[PDB]
């Protein structure tokens, strides 16, 4: 490291949990909570909170590549497989939450719904009469088509269409009967931290096309009511990324830690610092290297978000137990 950064270790065929939990760890607010919480009750192996503050106090104070098992054994993906039939968000989910619920009823209560819930309305519009519905729809991830989509913007573009319900597929519109009519999705919300995975792997082969993604992403257009106080520009903050066949591939993420364009390679034990254009452009696809998620982070959130975390923030009752650990292990 001539990063200040340290690696997590190849244990196993855990696919894009490594990026993901050096994405997670880099979401500086989010660490800082996972630390406060109460686990001291916890059991030392069942606890995925408690394997969680393990990972993350490694990845902050050790100069070796940090072990991921325990994480893995506590909740329960331990098999070839677990990791092959699900999604990334999935694990993402699973981690977020245990986390959440831990947090229920202490001071950091909400922490991950703050961070990256989103609010959109799926309506539904009839074309021969007066009905409409319109409801609301929590998320904390979205996932992005790509196959024919030269960038990022046409994907949202995509994403909210109008998508018409006729013939097979005709609309029940309860005392108006079966309709003609059209429906689509709309924003109200976007939150701090944005998660966007790109629908590359589908139904099971790769899709290796090219697809474009900026630095720095306007979404005030597919927003219902836009803030003149609070626009919607986002900053990208992590490319977690898949090299090779639709069987069988290398994953790195890159990410740029504090927010300031400083890019960094992490490659499960080896860190680097890498160019603006390896982190982004050369990910674009189209040799068959490209990204799967990225994330990206509100301009007017960037700072709390990446909030600096020091020493000083881990409670010492933790770090205790964390060290007792450390010597029941160095025991051999
Ligand atoms: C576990 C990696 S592997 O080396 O074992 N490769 C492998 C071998 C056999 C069968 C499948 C794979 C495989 C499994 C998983 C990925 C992968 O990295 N993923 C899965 C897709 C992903 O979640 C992104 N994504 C999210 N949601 C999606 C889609 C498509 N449609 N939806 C709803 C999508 O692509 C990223 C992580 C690669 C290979």
Redesign the pocket.
Known sequence: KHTGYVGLKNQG?T??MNSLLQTLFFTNQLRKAVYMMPTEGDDSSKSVPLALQRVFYELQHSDKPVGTKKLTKSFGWETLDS????????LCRVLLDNVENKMKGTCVEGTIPKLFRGKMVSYIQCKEVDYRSDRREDYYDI?LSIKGKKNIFESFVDYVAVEQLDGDNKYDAGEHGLQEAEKGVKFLTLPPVLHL??????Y?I?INDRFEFPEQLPLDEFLQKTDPKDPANYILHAVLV?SGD????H?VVYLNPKGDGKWCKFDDDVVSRCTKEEAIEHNYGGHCTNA??LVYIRESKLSEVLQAVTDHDIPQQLVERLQEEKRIEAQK
């Open positions: 065929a696919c894009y990791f092959m039939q699900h999604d990334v968000q999935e996932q995975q790109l629908m590359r792997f589908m099971n790769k898949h639709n069987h069988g591939g994953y799967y998620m």
